[PDB]
């Protein structure tokens, strides 16, 4: 059974989620779109291929198909747009954290250290709820990002850590409550660089984890859900690892071809000097 403290915990989390997660992306607009040595490393984009579809509120449909690597620039045509999508998502994530009392009560410095450390992770957790594993497309309201099929299909795509992460998590068929608790556990990570009240954060995280484990125990008796709590924690550990690698990937691209917005710069620690 769920204690009163646990029920209020989930409620506050769900309330924060509904108030700050624009699931239809209706407020995402004015975004940029692709025009009408260290480079070899920059080839990180390779493991990425997504077409973009924009459905007009009038019935019209714009569809974009990316180019192929053949020289230079070309592979950076989608960065501005993605930087804008990232920024929109980050704003929603920052808002999520701020409305939560457990977060508001932490020192302003720790709130920042926690947000810079978990923003990417929280964004992926939200993106997974709009991911369609049948069609391999993230349905963001009137925008859709579909994976461009190639060489070997599904098995070939799961080789990309982030993609395998999205399919695996989606396969667990989690409830809204379990997703928001995953966001909390990720947000309240006592082991982020720059955290002072690591003692309080650690205890808060354990409470969220305990609440999740109990939620699962109380509402998922099916044999298919055995070890679900542990599977979820392993996924969060994996997401943290994916976070570190993608940050390094982003910084390398940023160094050669700047695109990070001011908010992204803030979150990634870029000073502007
Ligand atoms: C449908 C989704 C998840 C859109 C936001 C995409 C990103 C904007 C961009 C997509 C890449 C291309 C080539 C179009 C890749 C990049 C890395 C940065 C590069 C410069 C290559 C990243 O690692 C991930 C990880 C997730 C994937 C599903 C591949 C993000 O979600 C981004 C992100 O910031 C999130 C956390 C909001 C990122 O910044």
Is 201 a pocket residue for ligand 1 (Cβ < 6 Å)?
A: no
Q: Which residue minimizes the CA distance to atom 8 of ligand 1?
A: 82
Whether ligand 1 lies within 6 angstroms of the CB of 243 is answered as no
What structural domains does the chain harbor?
A: 1-273 (1.10.565.10)
In the DSSP assignment, the letter for residue 194 is T
Strand runs labelled E in 59-182: 61-64, 131-132, 137-140, 143-147
Contact 121, 243 (CB under 8 A): yes
Q: What is the 162 CA–ligand 1 centroid distance (Å)?
A: 9
How many CA atoms are closer than 13 Å to the CA of 141, on its beta-carbon side?
12
Angstrom distance (rounded) from CA 87 to CA 115? 13
**b/e code 225-237 from CB counts within 10 Å (16+ = b):** eeebbeebeebbe
Q: How far is the CA of 197 from the centre of ligand 1 (A)?
A: 31
Instruction: Name residue, tokens 């019209």.
Output: 60
Sheet holding 137-140, edge to edge: 61-64, 50-55, 143-147, 137-140, 131-132
Neighbouring residues of 225: CB distance < 8 A, sequence distance ≥ 6: 216
Q: 18 burial class (0-12, 13-18, 19+ CB within 10 angstroms)?
A: exposed
How far away, in angstroms, is 243 Cα from ligand 1 center? 11
Q: Does the C-beta of 209 come closer than 6 Å to ligand 1?
A: no
In angstroms, rounded to a whole number, what is the distance separating the alpha carbons of residues 250 and 36? 25
Q: What angle, 0 to 180 degrees and rounded to 10, lies between the N-to-C axes of helices 161-171 and 228-256? A: 150
Q: How many degrees, rounded to 5, is the angle at CA 34 between CA 32 and CA 37? A: 110
Strand 131-132 to strand 61-64: parallel, antiparallel, or no bridges (unpaired)?
Answer: unpaired
Instruction: Check: CB of residue 243 under 8 Å from CB of residue 189.
Output: no
What spatial distance separates the first Cα and last Cα of the chain, rounded to whole Å?
54
Cα–Cα distance for residue pair 81/31, rounded to 1 Å: 6
Q: Which of 215, 210, 240, 238 is nearest to 225 (CA)?
A: 215
The answer for residues whose C-beta is within 8 angstroms of residue 203's C-beta and 6 or more apart is: none
Distance (Å, whole) CA 113 – CA 195: 6
Distances (CA, A) of 68 to 49, 242, 258: 10, 25, 21
- Indicate which residue's Cα is closest to atom 12 of ligand 1: 48
Distant-in-sequence contacts of 4-7, Cβ < 8 A, 24+ apart? 6/210, 6/211, 6/214, 6/215
Q: Is 267 in the pocket of ligand 1 (CB under 6 A)?
A: no
**CB-facing half-sphere around the CA of 181: CA atoms within 13 A:** 25
* Contacts of 232 by beta carbon, 8 Å cutoff, 6+ apart: 172, 174, 178, 182, 212
Return the structure tokens found at 201: 């954060």
d(CA 202, CA 114) in angstroms, rounded, equals 12
Query: What's this structure's resolution in Å?
Result: 2.2
Experimental method: X-ray
């Amino acid at each position: 059974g769920l204690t009163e403290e646990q029920r209020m915990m989930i409620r506050e989390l769900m309330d924060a989620q509904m108030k700050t997660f624009d699931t239809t992306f209706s407020h995402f607009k004015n975004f940029r779109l692709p025009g009408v040595k260290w480079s070899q490393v920059r080839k990180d984009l390779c493991s990425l291929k997504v077409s973009l579809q924009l459905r007009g509120e009038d019935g019209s449909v714009w569809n974009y198909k990316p180019p192929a690597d053949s020289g230079g620039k070309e592979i950076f045509s989608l960065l501005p747009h993605m930087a804008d999508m990232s920024t929109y998502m980050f704003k929603g994530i920052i808002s999520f954290a701020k409305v939560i009392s457990y977060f508001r009560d932490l020192p302003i410095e720790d709130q920042i250290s926690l947000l810079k450390g978990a923003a990417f992770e929280l964004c992926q957790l939200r993106f997974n709820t709009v991911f369609n594993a049948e069609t391999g497309t993230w349905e963001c309201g009137r925008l859709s990002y579909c994976l461009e099929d190639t060489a070997g299909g599904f098995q070939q795509l799961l080789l990309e850590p982030m993609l395998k992460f999205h399919y695996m998590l989606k396969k667990l068929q989690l409830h809204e409550e379990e997703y928001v608790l995953m966001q909390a556990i990720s947000l309240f990570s006592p082991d982020r660089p720059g955290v002072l009240q690591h003692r309080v954060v650690d205890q808060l995280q354990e409470q969220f984890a305990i609440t999740l484990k109990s939620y699962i125990e109380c509402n998922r008796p099916q044999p298919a859900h055995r070890f679900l709590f542990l599977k979820i924690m392993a996924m969060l550990t994996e997401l943290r690892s994916i976070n570190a690698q993608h940050t390094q990937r982003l910084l390398r691209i940023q160094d050669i071809h700047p695109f990070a917005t001011p908010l992204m710069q803030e979150l990634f620690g870029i000073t502007g000097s």
